[PDB]
Amino acid sequence: PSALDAIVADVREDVAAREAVVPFDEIKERAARAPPPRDVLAALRAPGVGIIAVYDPIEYAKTAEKYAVALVVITDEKYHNGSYEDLEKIRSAVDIPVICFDFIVDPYQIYLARAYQADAIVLILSVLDDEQYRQLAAVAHSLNMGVIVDVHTEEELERALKAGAEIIGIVNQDLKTFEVDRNTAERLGRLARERGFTGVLLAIGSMRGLFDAVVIGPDPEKAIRELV
Numbered sequence: 122p123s124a125l126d127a128i129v130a131d132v133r134e135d136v137a138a139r140e141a142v143v144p145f146d147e148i149k150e151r152a153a154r155a156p157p158p159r160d161v162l163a164a165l166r167a168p169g170v171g172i173i174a175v176y177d178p179i180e181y182a183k184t185a186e187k188y189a190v191a192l193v194v195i196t197d198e199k200y201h202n203g204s205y206e207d208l209e210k211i212r213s214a215v216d217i218p219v220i221c222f223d224f225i226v227d228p229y230q231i232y233l234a235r236a237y238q239a240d241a242i243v244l245i246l247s248v249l250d251d252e253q254y255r256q257l258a259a260v261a262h263s264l265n266m267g268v269i270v271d272v273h274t275e276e277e278l279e280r281a282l283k284a285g286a287e288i289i290g291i292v293n294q295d296l297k298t299f300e301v302d303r304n305t306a307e308r309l310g311r312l313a314r315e316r317g318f319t320g321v322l323l324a325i326g327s328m329r330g331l332f333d334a335v336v337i338g339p340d341p342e343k344a345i346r347e348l349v
Contacts, residue, residue: 241267
């Protein structure tokens with residue numbers, strides 16, 4: 122019995138179903154031909170604590186772009202549910218970068234996000250081992266997309282630090298036990314800085330003076346929504 126195992130199985134079968142109609146080689150080509158990503162790193166590095174808004178789609182996006190530095194669009198890997206087409210429509214309706222947030226274990230999903238014009242993706246270190254992390258980050262970076270590395274424990278933070286992650290998001294939920302530690306953000310963000318980290322810290326939730334941006338808002342999509 123394992124909620125996290127079930128989510129990973131859902132994602133892997135979602136990919137298998139998508140591949141049967143849009144094969145891996147075809148999604149790679151569509152991703153490579155997509156228009157270049159907007160720069161998520163620069164939007165988050167901008168002075169001040171930027172708001173990252175989370176997602177009628179067009180109305181909310183056009184409203185959100187008046188004050189947010191970036192937009193997060195939670196997607197659904199299940200077959201033929203319009204979720205990736207809506208990501209593209211939303212991104213096309215605004216002028217800020219759009220983060221595609223789903224549960225990525227397979228390179229197919231990164232090409233999929235890029236093909237529908239995502240500017241960045243999230244990698245979750247509680248889900249990924251070091252070899253998977255290296256592969257998936259390399260895929261995203263080969264398409265000039267930003268990578269947000271979500272961490273929840275001291276050990277995950279250290280992996281992100283040692284790997285040289287430039288954007289680290291700190292999440293308060295444990296994706297294996299599904300327990301919430303309401304003060305992880307302050308604890309790990311302070312620890313990140315005090316260990317010498319000079320990149321971008323995101324909080325996925327009064328930790329004043331620590332974070333460059335803050336995200337402002339079971340099956341895989343439900344689990345993502347809990348993270349935000």
